[PDB]
Structures are given as C-alpha cells and as structure tokens.
RNA sequence: GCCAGCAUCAGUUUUGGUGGCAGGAUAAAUCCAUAGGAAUGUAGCUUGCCUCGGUAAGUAUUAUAGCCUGUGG
RNA sequence: GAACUGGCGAUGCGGGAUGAACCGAACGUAGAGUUAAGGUGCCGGAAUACACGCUCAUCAGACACCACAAAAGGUGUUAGU
RNA sequence: GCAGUCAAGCGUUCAUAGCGACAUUGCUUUUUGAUUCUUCGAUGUCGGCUCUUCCUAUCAUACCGAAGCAGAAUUCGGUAA
RNA sequence: UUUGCUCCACACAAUAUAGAUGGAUACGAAUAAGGCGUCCUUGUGGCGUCGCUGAACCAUAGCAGGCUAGCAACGGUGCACUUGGCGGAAAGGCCUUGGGUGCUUGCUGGCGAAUUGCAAUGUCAUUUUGCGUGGGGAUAAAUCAUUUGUAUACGACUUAGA
C-alpha cells in the first residue's frame, strides 16, 4: 500500500562498537572484527545512544519493507558472533563403512578431507574458509565442529561439508550415510 | 550549444543515453562517448544476457557470414542501439555516424579534455531504487570480450597519471583565495556586487 | 471523465390535467458540465422511477461549492463498480481537501486497480468522516498520527538542457 | 589488443636474412640494414634508446630469429625470419637476454628434451583443385548414374534457397596452418657426432 | 570506543517546514506547509509572501532547510502572526540560496551600459588579484 | 527591367497582454461579530520514572498554541 | 447462401509499418491558416509534458478490423466482499 | 495425433508412487477430410539412392528430482536437440 | 625515361568544406549521499559551511582593433629561442626554468576614422594538390622474360640467377 515509515532496534551490547557510513557496516569486538556491504538494500541507519540503533525505511513497498525486519537480523548475526561466537557441530553417520575425516594443507591451504565414504576409492576435498576452525571433538565417537565469528562463512563451510557427501543412484532412505549439522550454537557455553 | 562534446557514459542507460546522441547527431553535434564498459540497463543481469543471447542466434543460414554481425565490445554495442535510431541507410545517415566515436575507458585525446553527463539518462534518476540493473561491463564479458581487464587497468592508471592533476588544481585555486581577499574589499569590489557580481 | 463539478439536479415527471404538483427529485452529481449533469441525472431515475428525458423535466441544475475547501477532510466513499464479469460494491477512503477530489482521485483509483471506467461506476454516496478511528483502512489511518514527519528521499532534479557539467545531486 | 611499438635489430647481418628482404637479390645494390647499421657506430645511444624503450612499456618480448639455411642440403639461401615469444620472468630480463644474444647461435637442446611433448606447425602438403569425394569423404554415387560419380547428389534443399556453407564442394586440398599436438620427443640429436 | 553512524541529514515535510515554490501565479515565493494530506499532497499557505490558502503537490514545491512553531490545521490569520515572530524571511534572505537568486534576478536586470562597467571593473580587479599571485 | 529595405493602409489570419462590466448561495470561503463542538488536547495542574528537571501518563475545553462546526454581516 | 445499407470493383489522397474493401476524407492549378483519423524517447514532424495509481515477467508488455490463446491454478503483489 | 484440468474408482490398506471412468479446456498441421484463393500459352506425379540443415512432443549419452527406489533391473518427471 | 626525390620555408595559382565565426573550461567515488575549508587520535573521526542547475567560470573596451606621449606597477599575456622533466590506451601532447623582445584597457591623455552614401555574409577560417625560385639531406627497388617444384586449371605460390 506504500508504508510511510518503518523501524526496528538493533540492541547494541559492551566491547562492541558498530562504525557505519553508507551501507558499509563494521562490527568491532572481544572475539575479533566483522564487516559487510549493503549498498543493494536502501535503508537509513540512526544512532540514539551507544547501547541502540534504529534501522528506517521511508515510503516502502511491501517487498522493500521485508528487507527492513532482514537487514536488523543481519547486523545482529555480525554483533553476536563477535562477542559469544558460532559453533556448528557434525554428527558422522554409517551403517557399515567408517567415514574417516582429517585435516591436510596443500599450498597455504586448509583441505577438510572426506575418505572411504560408502567404500568410495575417492577423495572429496572441502576448502576451509577464513575467519574458520576445524575441531575433531574427543569424548564424542565420530564430531567435526566448525568454530567462527562469521555465521554467514561457518554455516556454509559446514552446510558444503555436509552436501560433499551426497549418495548417488541409491534410495535415500535405506542409505542414510553422510555428515550432518546436528548442533548449532555459540563458542561460549551457558548461553 | 559547441564543436565537440565528450560524454562519460558511466551511469547511463544504453538505451536512453542511447538516443539523445542520435538525436544530437542529425543536428551537427560531433559527439564522443567514453568510457562505456560501465554503461547500464534496466533489468537483472541474469536476462539481458538472455536478450543478448538472441541477437546472437539470428544468423544467415546459408552463410553465417554475410549476416548480422554480433559485436561484443561494450562500445560497439552502445553504438548499435544508437545507431538503430539513425537512418543509415542513406547519406544524411552516414554523415551522422561519423560525427560519433566511442570507446570504453577514456584514452587520450579525451582524458585531458572535459567530459559531461546527460541527466535525463542517468540510472540514478530513472530509476526507482530497488530495481536491478546491469553494467555493459559484465555483459560484454560474458559474450566474449577478451578485453575488459586491460581496461580496467588503464583505468586504475589515469584515475591518477589524474587525481594528482587534482590535488594540484586544488592547492592552486586556494591561492588565489588567500590572496583574493587582500585586494577585493578594494573599491572595485563593492560596486561590483551592486551590478551583481 | 474530466474536471468535476458537484451538481444538484431538481427533475419532475411532466405535470398532468389529471396529477398536478408531481412529487421533485434531488440528486447530487459528480460531472463535467451542466449537459453531462442533466444526463448523468436521467440515467439514475430510469432505475428508481418510471420517467425519462421525455416523460420528464429538469427544474433546477445547481453548481454546488466545498463549503471548507482551504480544510483537509476524511472522505469515506461507497461505490457500485461493474467489473469484466459480476457487479460489486465497495467502501474506499480517500484523504482529500474537497467532494469534487474525493470523486476525481476516486475514479482514477477505480480505473487503476480494477480497470473500470466512468461508464461503469456509481458513486452510491460520499461521506465527510467527522471523527478518526470511524476512519477503517490502514492506508489512511498511516497519516491521524502524533505530530507527523517524513523526508522526500532521492530528490530528482529536473533539468530543461541536454547536457550537464556536474554529475548530480539526490540530497534533500 | 597486443600492438607492436618496437624493432631493435643487430649491428651485423647474416647474408641469409638480408636476402629475405628482396625478391631480386642479384639485381639489387643490397642496401637493406645500411643506414640502420650506421645507429650502431654513435657507443649505441640511439640503440639503448629502444631497448630501454621496451623495458619502459610493453608486456610482450619477442625475439626475431632466422634459420641457418645454407648449412643444410636445400636449394634455398634465403632464410626464414621468425618471431619468437620470450617466456622468462620480467620484461627487463627478457629484453636483457636478447640484447646478450644479438647475432648469437641457439641450438635446440638451450629449448628441446627427451620425454617433452611438442606442438608442431606447418602448411600442410599441397594437392590442387580436388573433387568433393576425396576433399570431403562423400560417398561415391552408384555406377548407374548419368552426367558422373564423384559428387554430392542433393547440393541442398528447395528453400534456404541458396547453396549453404555447410555442404560439400570441390576445391583446394592441402596447403593449409595445421597445429597438431603431443609430438612425444624421442631424441635430441647433435650433428658434431659420428 | 563509541558507535558513530554518519547521520542521514534530510529536510522533513511536516507542519510548519517552509517551502520556495518553483510551479506557476506562485513561483519564487515562500510558503508554510500547514496540513499534510498524503505522501505527495499537502495543504501550502503564505499570507506574508503573497501566497494562497492551496492544496499543492509536494513535486511543485521545494523544501527549504528553514522551519517554524506552527500548530496543525492553522488558518491563513494565525499563520501570518507565527510567521513575524520567528521572523521567517529575515533568516531565509540571510542564506546563500536567497542571495544567489537575488544575484542572478540582478544580472538579468543589467543594462547594456552596466554590463560594460562590470567588464571594466573585472579587468580593475583581475589585475590587483593577479598581483599577490606572484609574491605569495 | 532585375533584386530587395522601411513606412502607412488594405484582405486573411496567428500570438500576446491589460482593463470595464454581467451572472452564481446576488460565488463559496478566509476576515469581523454571534452560537455550538471536540481531540492526534496546547498551557496549567496531578502521578510514576528518571543526572537536580524534561519524558511520559493522565485529566481537562482556551487559559502562557490553536483547531472543527454552525448563525449574522 | 440469403436480408438492410454502405463500400470496393471504376478512387487517388493522410492514417493502420505493410494491405482492393478498415479509420479519416472523396481530387482543377497554386498560395496562406485550421484541423481529421492517427500521433508527439529515436528512426519521424510533434511534451524524455503534467497528474494519480498498478506491473518486474531465468519466454513481460505495447492499442480497433489484425494476423490469436483457454479451462484450471499461485501465502507474487494490489484493492475489495 | 499429443497435452491439460476436476476425481467415481483402481492400486492389499490409500483418490492422485504409477493409473484413471463420467466429463470438460486446449495445442499441433507428420493423418485424412472440407474448401476451391494461386497456377491448365505446363511449377516434371510415387518410392529409393545421395547430402546439408532446422524442430523437440528426448529412444540413447550428461546431471538431478519422484517411486508401490533395499541392491540389481525398471517406471514417471526436470534442464537439455 | 628529362636535372627527378625528400624535409622545412613563402610565393603564386588553385581545389574543396555534412558546415570555426571568443574558449571542448581534465578529480575520483556515492546518490537511503557527497563536495569544499578547518581541527585532530589520521578515523566510516569532530566542528563549520555549500547545493536547490553553466543564467556558471575564464577571456572580453582600442581602423577586423591604427600612429603616437606620460603616470602607476614588476605583474599579465603574444611571438619566436632554450634549460630540464613528465606521457604510449590513438603517446604526436602537457608542465617548467632561464634569457631575447613586443602589445599592454592597471590609471591619464592626444591626433585619425566620414562618401561602404538608410540594410545587403560584406568576404579576415582551414581542405588537399600543382608549378617555378631558394635553405639542409639521401643516392632504390618491383614487374616481365629466364629459371626451381616443397606450388599449380590459368593467374597465384615457392625458389634460383652480374
């Protein structure tokens, strides 16, 4: 209907300070910093006090207005990992062949290496992105964990990890083998 | 309104910037679009490449040659669509097409020299914000234009061998300001701003 | 249609030796001229009564003005567009200064959203709302708020010449 | 695209190459390369002039080369003057390597090895105006037919009412470049050596 | 360590905001947006500046940086009062804006003899300014 | 004879300004008096936060802003 | 294949790109002016006029005769009951 | 000829994994009819041979969804000429 | 083969002008943002300010810009010498020193302009070529014919030849 003006409030936690000119954002904090571009979007960010920021949209058509409640959540998800940090646990799974995952380094590089997947002689190699670290958690049989600041390199690095292990030409349902994103959380415990 | 006219395509709209320069033309207005690789268009990048896609299949059967030549080269392109709007196949045509040059990136006999814009044909005033748009830059690449990176180097350059033209034209004009208030309260300068000036 | 003028048209049903003093029918009209009007008139009576441009006659045809034009009012309006198919009723609301926009603006709106024309719309009734809140559709209620304010972003300026020297701007 | 901006030849010229720049060697006064030869008197200032001139600009060096033609059995005498792209590091190194090698020889083994994989290029053996049947691979028509076997029947359809580019017709076979590749190398020979 | 978020310094349309007009009668004249009908429509008024009370289109009017206190609705006498209290026009002709306008009406109102003077005087000036552009 | 320039007129048009009048609800309004009215309620006041108070939150009919609705001129 | 009339054939002219027949309008040779039907980003004479809305189409859409598309579906968006 | 929409039923059980009655909306011009506009001062009638090229309503090959896909084998479907 | 040719000059003839008639007057990036000045921790920093169209800015007075005299200034700008640099994307241009010398409307003068007869573009640009005087420079190929066969219908190709 062409809403006249929207707003939300990005709650700034302490630590952290989020400079913004144009629609470049810069998440400075305890765990590191994070930056992002939004030139594509059209919103007016407005300081009220260190603790608070009001990201508006004047005269928005309905599709413009959903892009206002995402922005917020985008600027929150650079605050969050910058303080509490993200941790994307992955469990392996297998009816028979034991999946063996390792980390090599060829030229720099940081490759997850993923072997003997359904007793393939293949090797699957995921490129570990920057920001993010890979732990093979003891105490937990089988649990690769990806742990960064961002969310929106982690959940991907993981996602790829999960998606390089797709079964071909079988019925999904019998062959449930693969690596999967069971856990999602933060570096800091309690919260 | 001048003998020549150096437009800088950037932030343009083939399409519109398109005309104006064909119109002009037919009215004796030697023009010289530059830069271009940074043209622009309505529509999400994808298309257009779809759009492009065709004016490509359209051939000549029986001899792929002698048929509709699909240039790539931002330049050429702009051109074309310019053109289309200038009746060539006559003389007045042609006598038109000459008047117009075109390059992607500001070479020399122009990097000098000033350039201008064409408001009525600026993205940034035609469109409405939110609508996706293009960049003949990509486009040309993508349908094969060997040279976009060789321009995009000679750009990094001259965006300087400019600036440093600048921070020098500007520390000048400024003294002329701190040596232009000593003499003006002068007598000459009060009568003046009565007539104006 | 064009630009309108409210109109008061007070027809009859021609007098007879039989029924002298034949009851007088008022109708507020939203038309272009007194030729319209006397037209737009008879069309509606040949739907409620048994008369026509013949068995009739138009007594008066008085332009009416807004009282407070100046005065920004909130016109609810009711409307019977036909469609392509059946016919539908409506209750649109239109914030405007006087009747004679409330009907103009409306017709443009009933055009754009529903592809109707002047042909196919009956403006059943128009009614200055007195109090807010009786106002019920968000695209008005948007504007009846505490000390209202907004910018006019991306200001584009309008030039005559062909060329220009600056490369603009859209500050405001 | 590349654009050649320099040519810096040597002081001396072997007379093989000179002869390339003539159609009539015997009738000429044989002037080629005597005012450029001067230019090399001037230390050679006018000469670092161009080599420094390359260094300054230019993304791509190419050595000019020619063949020892008369050191071989052929009846030629006129050498083949080619262009060579260098492939070392830095622009200055590349012109610097050349500067050292003006009028200097370069034997296969600076270039080729055992067990490399080379790409050879030639104008293919020419044959003349060859029939469609052999130039193309087209089937011979049957013994029966009038007016001639060795043809394509339908040259093309009713419409697209023009003989198409993509049919088969008699003309030049052979004498084409052709860049066939992967021509393992089996031996690096040395004259030299009984 | 504090946030800092540039600003984004716009001129609002609201009760008061005062507007040069550019079309059309008014043109070149200051008015006060009183009510505010919708996004593009507003009810304008400027008794002091020779301007009627009118529902205009927020394209045909331009937002000045000035504004003032004005209550909602208020009729033409009441606007005229708030007007010399804040004293509108005296802030307006103080800006560069109104001066640039009054400068150019002046240049348009120049006479063939005056235009000859301004070249004589500019010649005076070039000289003296070219002066210190040499010593300093 | 050939080619034009201006002037004042004719015929046909075209493009502007500017005033005098006649209508309309003897325009409607605004403006002045005279009655009713409300809230997106200004001031005062009261209550609770809160950096010595301004946010709110009420209340409330012109008061240290004005607004609407009618009668009369 | 019939009815009423108007066309074309026997008819150019401006317009529908183009086309007997549709829309304008029917012709001596020329000069001014006004329009019709159509139009006014550029081919092209004429507003990249003004005003309010709807629409983003990884096969958008674009104007009577006319050179096509339906049933049926869509938490794509807009008004509605 | 090739496709849709609703869904009585089939499919152990369950309308729609795969089918699908009674109904109904389409497309196509590789069937054949209908028509008689072009050609009767002639456009060389069938089929095979030969040889380009185009269409996609995809048999195979590439990559994926779906299954009444456990594997093997097979069915429906996508982007694809 | 008629003492040709090349470069810079100027003289005269021509021959054109898709069209000089003061000056194409140089940041870059974003436009839901930037410019310009200024302070500072040199940062997406603070403070001030401008736009709201080049209607700007530069040049611009002298017989189509004449001959002349001074005053104030040590500047402006033409023309030709030369020091040193920058630039190759089509560089074919841009800046800068040190002079040689004009004109100076920065302020003040004095002569001349008429009859081009009341307007008539009232001709001052820059294209390419040709013919001679005069200041430096240079001193060749190709084709046929003949010949070869890595070539070839013929032309073409490829070699050979004081």
Tab-separated table of N, CA and C in Angstrom, chain A residues 55-123:
chain	number	residue	atom	x	y	z
A	55	UNK	N	17.445	1.041	12.529
A	55	UNK	CA	17.389	0.777	11.097
A	55	UNK	C	15.957	0.481	10.658
A	56	UNK	N	15.740	2.899	9.291
A	56	UNK	CA	14.351	3.062	8.888
A	56	UNK	C	14.179	2.804	7.390
A	57	UNK	N	12.925	2.809	6.936
A	57	UNK	CA	12.584	2.671	5.514
A	57	UNK	C	11.385	3.570	5.195
A	58	UNK	N	11.652	4.745	4.634
A	58	UNK	CA	10.601	5.729	4.375
A	58	UNK	C	9.946	5.530	3.009
A	59	UNK	N	8.660	5.181	3.009
A	59	UNK	CA	7.860	5.040	1.786
A	59	UNK	C	8.162	3.732	1.059
A	60	UNK	N	8.127	2.635	1.809
A	60	UNK	CA	8.495	1.325	1.279
A	60	UNK	C	7.325	0.525	0.731
A	61	UNK	N	7.532	-0.096	-0.429
A	61	UNK	CA	6.588	-1.071	-0.973
A	61	UNK	C	6.825	-2.398	-0.285
A	62	UNK	N	5.781	-3.213	-0.174
A	62	UNK	CA	5.788	-4.361	0.747
A	62	UNK	C	7.036	-5.246	0.677
A	63	UNK	N	7.573	-5.434	-0.525
A	63	UNK	CA	8.799	-6.212	-0.699
A	63	UNK	C	10.030	-5.471	-0.176
A	64	UNK	N	9.986	-4.141	-0.201
A	64	UNK	CA	11.036	-3.315	0.398
A	64	UNK	C	11.008	-3.423	1.929
A	65	UNK	N	9.809	-3.327	2.497
A	65	UNK	CA	9.609	-3.354	3.948
A	65	UNK	C	10.074	-4.669	4.542
A	66	UNK	N	9.989	-6.517	3.100
A	66	UNK	CA	10.516	-7.348	4.183
A	66	UNK	C	11.975	-7.032	4.501
A	67	UNK	N	12.660	-6.367	3.577
A	67	UNK	CA	14.112	-6.196	3.668
A	67	UNK	C	14.590	-5.269	4.796
A	68	UNK	N	13.657	-4.646	5.511
A	68	UNK	CA	13.986	-3.783	6.644
A	68	UNK	C	14.444	-4.590	7.852
A	69	UNK	N	12.785	-6.446	8.504
A	69	UNK	CA	12.961	-6.926	9.869
A	69	UNK	C	14.281	-7.670	9.976
A	70	UNK	N	14.966	-8.054	7.112
A	70	UNK	CA	16.159	-8.841	7.419
A	70	UNK	C	17.346	-7.980	7.868
A	71	UNK	N	17.679	-6.941	7.102
A	71	UNK	CA	18.881	-6.141	7.363
A	71	UNK	C	20.143	-6.737	8.042
A	72	UNK	N	18.347	-5.652	10.269
A	72	UNK	CA	18.441	-5.973	11.677
A	72	UNK	C	19.152	-7.308	11.879
A	73	UNK	N	18.450	-8.415	11.638
A	73	UNK	CA	18.964	-9.748	11.970
A	73	UNK	C	20.340	-10.027	11.359
A	74	UNK	N	20.580	-9.532	10.145
A	74	UNK	CA	21.953	-9.461	9.608
A	74	UNK	C	23.084	-8.727	10.334
A	75	UNK	N	22.742	-7.595	10.943
A	75	UNK	CA	23.686	-6.831	11.745
A	75	UNK	C	23.855	-7.521	13.097
A	76	UNK	N	22.784	-8.141	13.593
A	76	UNK	CA	22.839	-8.911	14.835
A	76	UNK	C	23.725	-10.137	14.678
A	77	UNK	N	23.358	-11.014	13.748
A	77	UNK	CA	24.130	-12.229	13.480
A	77	UNK	C	25.585	-11.926	13.151
A	78	UNK	N	26.531	-9.248	12.788
A	78	UNK	CA	27.908	-9.701	12.687
A	78	UNK	C	28.532	-9.950	14.052
A	79	UNK	N	27.120	-8.469	15.506
A	79	UNK	CA	27.303	-8.410	16.944
A	79	UNK	C	27.544	-9.796	17.544
A	80	UNK	N	26.497	-10.616	17.594
A	80	UNK	CA	26.534	-11.874	18.361
A	80	UNK	C	27.811	-12.572	18.803
A	81	UNK	N	28.383	-13.069	16.121
A	81	UNK	CA	29.481	-13.905	16.597
A	81	UNK	C	30.650	-13.154	17.220
A	82	UNK	N	30.611	-11.824	17.184
A	82	UNK	CA	31.767	-11.012	17.577
A	82	UNK	C	32.068	-11.005	19.075
A	83	UNK	N	31.042	-11.178	19.902
A	83	UNK	CA	31.233	-11.220	21.350
A	83	UNK	C	31.833	-12.559	21.808
A	84	UNK	N	29.698	-13.762	21.492
A	84	UNK	CA	29.568	-15.089	22.052
A	84	UNK	C	30.185	-16.135	21.125
A	85	UNK	N	30.402	-15.768	19.862
A	85	UNK	CA	30.923	-16.702	18.870
A	85	UNK	C	29.936	-17.820	18.616
A	86	UNK	N	30.446	-18.591	16.200
A	86	UNK	CA	29.451	-19.660	16.221
A	86	UNK	C	30.122	-21.026	16.203
A	87	UNK	N	29.363	-22.038	16.607
A	87	UNK	CA	29.858	-23.404	16.725
A	87	UNK	C	28.864	-24.337	16.054
A	88	UNK	N	29.221	-24.818	14.868
A	88	UNK	CA	28.333	-25.673	14.087
A	88	UNK	C	28.788	-27.127	14.086
A	89	UNK	N	28.385	-27.854	15.127
A	89	UNK	CA	28.573	-29.296	15.180
A	89	UNK	C	27.606	-29.905	14.171
A	90	UNK	N	29.317	-31.773	13.702
A	90	UNK	CA	28.794	-32.580	12.617
A	90	UNK	C	29.521	-33.915	12.596
A	91	UNK	N	26.368	-34.806	13.946
A	91	UNK	CA	27.318	-35.858	13.593
A	91	UNK	C	27.004	-36.488	12.237
A	92	UNK	N	29.628	-37.748	12.379
A	92	UNK	CA	29.431	-38.512	11.153
A	92	UNK	C	28.340	-39.561	11.345
A	93	UNK	N	27.852	-40.084	10.229
A	93	UNK	CA	26.912	-41.196	10.223
A	93	UNK	C	27.296	-42.110	9.073
A	94	UNK	N	26.871	-44.149	9.925
A	94	UNK	CA	27.150	-45.043	8.816
A	94	UNK	C	26.767	-46.456	9.205
A	95	UNK	N	26.002	-47.116	8.347
A	95	UNK	CA	25.562	-48.477	8.621
A	95	UNK	C	26.724	-49.464	8.585
A	96	UNK	N	27.757	-49.156	7.800
A	96	UNK	CA	28.887	-50.066	7.656
A	96	UNK	C	30.236	-49.357	7.530
A	97	UNK	N	30.481	-48.704	6.399
A	97	UNK	CA	31.798	-48.132	6.134
A	97	UNK	C	32.084	-46.965	7.071
A	98	UNK	N	33.225	-47.005	7.778
A	98	UNK	CA	33.549	-45.934	8.715
A	98	UNK	C	34.183	-44.725	8.031
A	99	UNK	N	33.483	-43.593	8.055
A	99	UNK	CA	33.988	-42.363	7.448
A	99	UNK	C	35.193	-41.854	8.232
A	100	UNK	N	36.273	-41.569	7.509
A	100	UNK	CA	37.500	-41.056	8.098
A	100	UNK	C	37.764	-39.634	7.601
A	101	UNK	N	37.682	-38.666	8.509
A	101	UNK	CA	37.898	-37.265	8.161
A	101	UNK	C	39.174	-36.753	8.820
A	102	UNK	N	39.935	-35.964	8.065
A	102	UNK	CA	41.224	-35.433	8.504
A	102	UNK	C	41.439	-34.002	8.040
A	103	UNK	N	42.377	-33.325	8.692
A	103	UNK	CA	42.950	-32.095	8.165
A	103	UNK	C	44.454	-32.124	8.404
A	104	UNK	N	44.258	-31.573	5.700
A	104	UNK	CA	45.679	-31.524	5.401
A	104	UNK	C	46.095	-30.061	5.200
A	105	UNK	N	47.130	-29.821	4.397
A	105	UNK	CA	47.460	-28.473	3.948
A	105	UNK	C	48.311	-28.510	2.680
A	106	UNK	N	47.689	-28.171	1.552
A	106	UNK	CA	48.384	-28.068	0.275
A	106	UNK	C	48.334	-26.632	-0.243
A	107	UNK	N	49.415	-25.889	-0.006
A	107	UNK	CA	49.600	-24.528	-0.533
A	107	UNK	C	48.775	-23.478	0.219
A	108	UNK	N	49.146	-23.224	1.474
A	108	UNK	CA	48.534	-22.153	2.267
A	108	UNK	C	48.149	-22.573	3.673
A	109	UNK	N	46.762	-24.816	2.584
A	109	UNK	CA	45.552	-24.178	2.089
A	109	UNK	C	44.426	-24.286	3.105
A	110	UNK	N	44.325	-25.454	3.740
A	110	UNK	CA	43.218	-25.782	4.631
A	110	UNK	C	41.935	-25.867	3.821
A	111	UNK	N	42.929	-28.377	3.073
A	111	UNK	CA	41.721	-29.174	2.921
A	111	UNK	C	41.772	-30.381	3.853
A	112	UNK	N	39.196	-29.584	4.589
A	112	UNK	CA	38.689	-30.860	5.080
A	112	UNK	C	38.819	-31.944	4.007
A	113	UNK	N	39.335	-33.106	4.405
A	113	UNK	CA	39.468	-34.259	3.517
A	113	UNK	C	38.447	-35.324	3.908
A	114	UNK	N	37.566	-35.669	2.972
A	114	UNK	CA	36.487	-36.624	3.221
A	114	UNK	C	36.350	-37.614	2.060
A	115	UNK	N	37.239	-39.558	3.771
A	115	UNK	CA	37.596	-40.668	2.903
A	115	UNK	C	36.660	-41.848	3.132
A	116	UNK	N	36.803	-42.872	2.294
A	116	UNK	CA	36.073	-44.133	2.441
A	116	UNK	C	34.572	-43.953	2.712
A	117	UNK	N	33.960	-43.005	2.011
A	117	UNK	CA	32.539	-42.723	2.173
A	117	UNK	C	31.715	-43.706	1.355
A	118	UNK	N	31.138	-44.700	2.025
A	118	UNK	CA	30.434	-45.805	1.362
A	118	UNK	C	31.370	-46.644	0.481
A	119	UNK	N	32.600	-46.848	0.956
A	119	UNK	CA	33.600	-47.690	0.283
A	119	UNK	C	33.496	-47.768	-1.231
A	120	UNK	N	33.374	-44.867	-1.014
A	120	UNK	CA	34.042	-44.563	-2.269
A	120	UNK	C	35.547	-44.512	-2.049
A	121	UNK	N	36.842	-45.507	-4.267
A	121	UNK	CA	38.175	-45.241	-3.736
A	121	UNK	C	38.429	-43.734	-3.590
A	122	UNK	N	37.442	-42.924	-3.965
A	122	UNK	CA	37.523	-41.471	-3.829
A	122	UNK	C	37.439	-41.082	-2.352
A	123	UNK	N	39.123	-38.729	-3.818
A	123	UNK	CA	38.879	-38.226	-2.472
A	123	UNK	C	38.102	-36.912	-2.535
